[PDB]
Design a protein around this ligand. Structure first.
Ligand SMILES: *[C@@H]1O[C@H](CO)[C@@H](O[C@@H]2O[C@H](CO)[C@@H](O[C@@H]3O[C@H](CO[C@H]4O[C@H](CO)[C@@H](O)[C@H](O)[C@@H]4O)[C@@H](O)[C@H](O)[C@@H]3O)[C@H](O)[C@H]2NC(C)=O)[C@H](O)[C@H]1NC(C)=O
Ligand SMILES: *[C@@H]1O[C@H](CO)[C@@H](O[C@@H]2O[C@H](CO)[C@@H](O[C@@H]3O[C@H](CO[C@H]4O[C@H](CO)[C@@H](O)[C@H](O)[C@@H]4O)[C@@H](O)[C@H](O)[C@@H]3O)[C@H](O)[C@H]2NC(C)=O)[C@H](O)[C@H]1NC(C)=O
Ligand SMILES: *[C@@H]1O[C@H](CO)[C@@H](O[C@@H]2O[C@H](CO)[C@@H](O[C@@H]3O[C@H](CO[C@H]4O[C@H](CO)[C@@H](O)[C@H](O)[C@@H]4O)[C@@H](O)[C@H](O)[C@@H]3O)[C@H](O)[C@H]2NC(C)=O)[C@H](O)[C@H]1NC(C)=O
Ligand SMILES: Fc1ccc([C@@H]2CCNC[C@H]2COc2ccc3c(c2)OCO3)cc1
Ligand SMILES: Fc1ccc([C@@H]2CCNC[C@H]2COc2ccc3c(c2)OCO3)cc1
Ligand SMILES: Fc1ccc([C@@H]2CCNC[C@H]2COc2ccc3c(c2)OCO3)cc1
Ligand SMILES: *[C@@H]1O[C@H](CO)[C@@H](O)[C@H](O)[C@H]1NC(C)=O
Ligand SMILES: *[C@@H]1O[C@H](CO)[C@@H](O)[C@H](O)[C@H]1NC(C)=O
Ligand SMILES: *[C@@H]1O[C@H](CO)[C@@H](O)[C@H](O)[C@H]1NC(C)=O
Ligand SMILES: *[C@@H]1O[C@H](CO)[C@@H](O)[C@H](O)[C@H]1NC(C)=O
Ligand SMILES: *[C@@H]1O[C@H](CO)[C@@H](O)[C@H](O)[C@H]1NC(C)=O
Ligand SMILES: *[C@@H]1O[C@H](CO)[C@@H](O)[C@H](O)[C@H]1NC(C)=O
Ligand SMILES: *[C@@H]1O[C@H](CO)[C@@H](O)[C@H](O)[C@H]1NC(C)=O
Ligand SMILES: *[C@@H]1O[C@H](CO)[C@@H](O)[C@H](O)[C@H]1NC(C)=O
Ligand SMILES: *[C@@H]1O[C@H](CO)[C@@H](O)[C@H](O)[C@H]1NC(C)=O
Ligand SMILES: *[C@@H]1O[C@H](CO)[C@@H](O)[C@H](O)[C@H]1NC(C)=O
Ligand SMILES: *[C@@H]1O[C@H](CO)[C@@H](O)[C@H](O)[C@H]1NC(C)=O
Ligand SMILES: *[C@@H]1O[C@H](CO)[C@@H](O)[C@H](O)[C@H]1NC(C)=O
Lengths: 251, 131, 131, 251, 131, 251
């Protein structure tokens, strides 16, 4: 079960290692060999913060590992975590020297909060990698933007600007069955997050709150709850405010 | 084997980023002091699903993970940069790591043009036979 | 050279440990989150001194130390992982780093089967000679 | 004097680099190339703590070096050092990231104590390596289990559970001509160590002390001395208690 | 291309330092505990400008910088040790990465001695023709 | 624009990559491949401290990079910097593990002082490298001796003791248009430095001050200024004291 290698035969991609190669297949340079990273986004996985975080878990006893890749895919959703334990200690390690954030992210979901963090490192429960700047890791680094993805290896044949937007979230019970999320309008105005909410809906809801004047006008916390009446697949193929801590409802 | 995309969806278009490792430098832009910062070293391109290559790539990277993860478990390097170099070496070893028996299936030596250099230069003796 | 064990004793049996780099993964065991910890990635085996291999291995590693230590003194890498890859490259360079003069001692090209493809296909002209 | 390479010719192992190789010798993959580590145990060296520690010494001016190996040998004796100077400062460096203890050790001789440590790093006086988890180093790391060994490089032809026991020792004058060792029965009961003592004898002596009730029943230190009447080669080919700090004798 | 020194001056003599990677060890000097410190591992030599090699070397290193700096910008390795190994691999791939068409310009196979092994052993049939 | 490779053809050096190589060109071992470092000294650049420091500048956003080389050139002038900001914080990073000073330096110009240091790392403004012990870096490390140089790569054909002297300088406004330098005779005796001063002249001037008794005989600072009457190309091809802080003039 050696590392598969992508090669083009009969106008079709297929796996074929250096030993399953015919004499006609020609490799003139290491330039023809390329490592690439593909985003789990492109396979149809749910990208909302509640769904994405449940694919990650904490585990001890497994040393982290890093492998480089040369080309990556522009991501719609990336993630940046600042998680602490309830006693204030850090759950995630600082980024090692030379590991920078994923370079192309339309939306960076920055999640800050708390959780038990029963493990030395946070891994991907489905075996995928956390993609950084041309480096893929098995673990999550603190405050470092990543995209979920996997790596492929290829033998090549011989042969819109960049906009990024940060979306901030508060979390409690991170990495558990009972995890609560809040979308941050400002430091005092929050919205109870659900998996149905798309990035564009969060930004429009946040704009509506500002442009209509529904931010907290006190020193206390204001949590808006969207009622299920307001509805919200793949990214590439596409109100009245009442107050009742200070919970409220948006109809 | 041939690859079969078994994912719930496929984005058939690949908007990619990479680095121009040695792109035509413009004046002093190659000097690190004057050149771009870490965020501005990237080029971009767009690829479409001709020959089903994009959906094949996504399945290939998916199927590569198990073997790649097992390789990473067995190595003690903290960061692995040598996978492609070793694959190039293994490419040469499978073809040239032993004795190349000409006309054998595992020997990539074509004596075509030059079998037609012996078999046509026989005519310098067989009929240059002036008796 | 041939190796001569010159040690005070030799344990003729080798109880070894290593890693199955890509062993047949069992379900989800290849996923780092679910897989074994650092202590449980090892396989074991037992080898005996057939052909004197074990006592030869012990002397070989003993005699390797001087050259290995001198190589480590001269390198600036803190951790060296490329010794075997460079030996594979040097294997190919000694055989294929120059022009391969067929039938020469330093050219590993065997034209055996296909000398018997010219010297027997001479009979398509020499006695296909119908006059 | 390049790095020797092991190859099998005429049913016998021998050294022969890539340049001393005949055309029949065939290398189809990097899988045929293997780096292995062999334990000094297998060559008949004395493995007791007093004899083993005298093969190590402190030296400054020489940068440490590390080389990996892929397969190792199950060890009977391994060593784990926590040595400080008399002023409390550490003599050995913390293990670098990714360097773990030797994975197969029947007995781990854990030595804690003091010494002058006249050098930045501790090297092997005979040029051997300290074998860790698939990594061989020229120096000793603090509190990290290692086996003494050497590395070989091979071209392969084409072609009992794991029990571990920790034995603890106290040391004074470590790394000198006048080094004293004490086998630790508990934090208050000790035995003066001599080179004659095998691991199995230390564990049996320690069991006898517990099962007969000869541990210290005060708050003071109890040092048992075995008298030379009680006797104790290769591991693979195989009383009356009177008290007189508190020294004593075991007959 | 050929190199043209375009520097204001050239020191035509090269007083160099390097490491004897595996020099004839003298007794115990190969053991790190007994061997020299970091400052005493160097050998020295003196080279003169025969064939203009020294002034060519200075211009070569000067002209190498742009491509080297661009390679360093594109890599994520903090310390690069594999440039020469990859150049050795690329040496072999350009010569042996495809099928070697004998007598072709890109195939480094010389059948010289042994064309004169067929064309002279024709005389074992053509005039060993006893009728 | 791949990395050029030096090869010898027709009794002349020239660039020719592995792909521009003829079948006669033979590479039997990786030993024939060599990386070398050449000093900017050998090309005629000004080596005095005022001229050399202006080739270096501070810049943020560019990660440092390191490449090794196997052979280097004996240097006449090397440099060793201990620069802080006026608030006392360090301007240069500590040397990473395994990076030591350039091994052959006739004169080590050790410059200590202050500057604004408007950048995370100090780079070479002309794209050259800072050469350390068999490692070339794009940035300057604190207190680590380096020589300015560039790297070449070669295919080789098949085929006076070491004295070092440290010269110490004080600096203000380092890395700016208005930078002042002082050659240090002792902790209280200094000479205003100019680009005209060679290393041998500084050592002779320093000897004259000691052997004639012109060091400061108080607790205050004594700055000698050499008047332009006293004169001072390539290194390889070659008084009355009046006092007027305490400035003075040497005629
Ligand atoms: C490569 O692509 C594969 C196919 O897309 C990926 O397969 C995924 O593998 C993970 C395990 O690592 C599966 O997760 C499990 O899902 C089951 C069932 O989850 C729910 O969904 C089914 C319908 O799909 C529903 O009927 C059930 O009642 C469940 O409610 C859970 O029980 C497990 O605990 C675990 O979460 C994925 O389901 C599976 N996806 C698919 C589409 O089959 C594979 O992970 C990819 N490899 C990498 C490295 O990314
Ligand atoms: C590879 O195997 C070799 C053979 O097993 C190892 O050779 C060993 O080399 C070391 C030096 O590094 C020697 O240690 C020296 O020993 C002498 C003598 O010690 C006492 O022993 C003799 C009898 O053997 C006795 O007659 C003397 O009076 C001494 O009392 C000391 O004087 C030195 O100071 C130093 O300690 C070993 O003796 C030697 N062993 C053998 C069996 O020859 C070699 O080290 C191995 N290489 C590696 C890397 O492990
Ligand atoms: C390889 O060798 C090349 C030739 O030796 C090096 O070329 C040098 O490139 C740098 C730019 O990185 C130039 O520096 C510039 O100089 C100009 C002019 O400076 C003064 O000198 C001229 C006469 O030479 C004078 O007429 C002017 O009025 C100036 O007073 C400045 O304006 C720029 O700001 C910048 O400093 C060097 O001048 C140039 N040298 C030569 C001899 O052409 C090249 O740097 C080398 N590569 C490496 C990596 O070292
Ligand atoms: F690193 C490199 C790989 C391939 C090239 C190709 C060279 C020819 N022109 C098209 C380029 C295709 O780039 C790809 C292919 C698969 C990818 C990818 C980008 O991102 C994630 O999966 C350039 C650089
Ligand atoms: F890394 C690897 C090396 C060799 C294999 C071989 C493959 C075939 N079956 C037997 C295996 C022998 O393993 C060895 C040989 C020498 C050793 C050793 C183990 O430990 C210290 O010295 C597997 C893995
Ligand atoms: F690393 C090595 C490179 C070359 C050798 C050559 C082997 C044969 N005898 C002469 C040696 C020349 O050394 C060089 C050449 C260019 C240089 C250099 C030294 O310093 C900066 O630029 C040894 C070691
Ligand atoms: C999480 O909560 C649910 C509530 O239904 C429970 O069934 C589940 O066991 C909990 N998870 C764990 C790991 O206990
Ligand atoms: C919002 O909170 C963050 C985190 O404490 C803080 O850094 C930021 O300054 C706050 N913003 C405002 C406007 O107070
Ligand atoms: C929310 O709306 C305000 C008002 O325009 C804007 O400044 C802010 O950036 C928005 N938040 C996000 C996360 O875009
Ligand atoms: C005061 O706060 C309420 C929320 O409690 C908000 O809806 C309202 O717009 C605020 N009033 C003004 C004048 O901003
Ligand atoms: C250690 O002590 C012995 C006592 O006989 C002495 O001969 C030897 O010189 C001492 N070692 C050193 C290094 O002084
Ligand atoms: C024995 O001593 C060690 C080291 O101080 C300590 O960690 C351990 O707890 C002690 N054991 C007991 C039973 O006190
Ligand atoms: C010594 O004997 C006691 C009593 O059984 C046991 O608990 C302890 O582990 C023994 N010590 C060692 C080092 O085995
Ligand atoms: C008390 O201590 C002595 C050692 O001084 C020991 O031999 C004896 O067994 C102890 N007595 C009991 C009752 O444990
Ligand atoms: C440095 O000072 C000179 C004085 O003539 C001035 O012309 C120049 O602009 C200054 N440099 C900068 C970067 O401002
Ligand atoms: C000169 O100054 C340096 C730096 O403060 C100091 O280390 C050194 O001891 C001083 N020398 C004398 C003789 O005081
Ligand atoms: C300056 O001269 C004194 C007197 O001999 C000497 O000790 C000192 O080393 C000299 N300074 C330098 C930098 O050589
Ligand atoms: C006292 O200091 C002056 C400089 O101010 C110096 O030239 C003179 O030689 C010193 N006198 C003695 C006796 O050292």
């Amino acid at each position: 079960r050696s590392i598969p290698l992508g090669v083009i035969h009969n106008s079709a991609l297929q796996v074929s290692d250096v030993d399953k190669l015919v004499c006609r297949d020609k490799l003139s340079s290491t330039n023809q060999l390329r490592s690439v990273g593909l985003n789990l986004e492109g396979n149809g996985v749910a990208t909302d913060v509640p769904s994405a975080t449940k694919r990650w878990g904490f585990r001890s006893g497994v040393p982290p590992k890093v492998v480089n890749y040369e080309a990556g895919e522009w991501a719609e959703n990336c993630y940046n975590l600042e998680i602490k334990k309830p006693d204030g200690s850090e759950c995630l390690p600082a980024a090692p020297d030379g590991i920078r954030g994923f370079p192309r992210c339309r939306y960076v979901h920055k999640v800050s909060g708390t959780g038990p963090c029963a493990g030395d490192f946070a891994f991907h429960k489905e075996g995928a990698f956390f993609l950084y700047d041309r480096l893929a890791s098995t673990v999550i680094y603190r405050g470092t933007t990543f995209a979920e993805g996997v790596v492929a290896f290829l033998i090549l044949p011989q042969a819109s600007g960049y906009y990024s937007t940060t979306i901030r979230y508060q979390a409690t019970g991170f990495g558990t069955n009972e995890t609560e999320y809040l979308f941050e309008v400002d430091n005092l105005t929050y919205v109870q997050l659900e998996s149905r909410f798309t990035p564009q809906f969060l930004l429009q809801l946040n704009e509506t709150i500002y442009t209509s004047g529904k931010r907290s006008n006190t020193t206390g916390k204001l949590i808006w709850k969207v009622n299920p009446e307001i509805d919200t697949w793949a990214f590439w193929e596409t109100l009245s405010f009442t107050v009742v801590x200070x919970x409220x409802x948006x109809x | 084997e041939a690859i079969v995309n078994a994912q719930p969806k496929c984005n058939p278009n690949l908007h990619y980023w990479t680095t121009q490792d040695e792109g035509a430098a413009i004046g002093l832009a190659w000097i690190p002091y004057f050149g771009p910062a870490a965020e501005g070293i990237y080029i971009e391109g767009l690829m479409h699903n001709q020959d089903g290559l994009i959906c094949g790539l996504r399945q290939l990277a998916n199927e590569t993970t198990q073997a790649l993860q097992l390789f990473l478990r067995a190595t003690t390097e903290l960061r692995t940069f040598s996978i492609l170099n070793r694959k190039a070496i293994d490419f040469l070893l499978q073809r040239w790591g032993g004795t190349c028996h000409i006309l054998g299936p595992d020997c990539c030596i074509e004596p075509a043009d030059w079998t037609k250099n012996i078999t046509d230069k026989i005519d310098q003796i067989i009929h240059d036979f002036v008796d």
